[PDB]
Amino acid sequence: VKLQQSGGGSVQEGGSLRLSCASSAGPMGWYRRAPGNERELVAGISRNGRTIYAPSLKDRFTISRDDDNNILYLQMSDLTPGDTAVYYCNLNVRTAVAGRNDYWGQGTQVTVSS
């Protein structure tokens, strides 16, 4: 299993991005890590679609999963440099044959220019 990410990069302040994470099931989540800081959960989604957000990010970030195409998305709006970070998707599964597995995307740099 591999998670492949897209949709980030440089973006002007006030702009918006839609990150994608394609798993080439289980709960998934988006995390971010800014330079010199620890990882933080931005949003997660259960197999059945229940969502959880970092309280302070809920108003600008939305997580969704496309089950027809197998794509996880993070819509992020009204950005500032406070949102500059590497963003990572995660898929954490528990199956019958293999047991537990934990998969991460390669990371997507988002750089908001002010």
Residue numbers in the entry: 2 to 25, 31 to 120
Sentences from the paper on this structure:
A substantial amount of restructuring occurs in the CDR3 loop between free and bound sdAbs, with a more compacted unbound loop tending to splay out in a toggle bolt–like manner.
Dali homology searching had previously located a similar secondary structure within the Ebolavirus genus NP, two of the three alpha helices being identified as forming a dorsal “V”-like shelf and a much smaller, shallower basin, well upstream of the C-terminus. In our present study, we show the consequences of this FR interfacing in recontouring the sdAb surface to be more accommodating to undulating and convex antigenic landscapes, bypassing the need for a concave epitope.
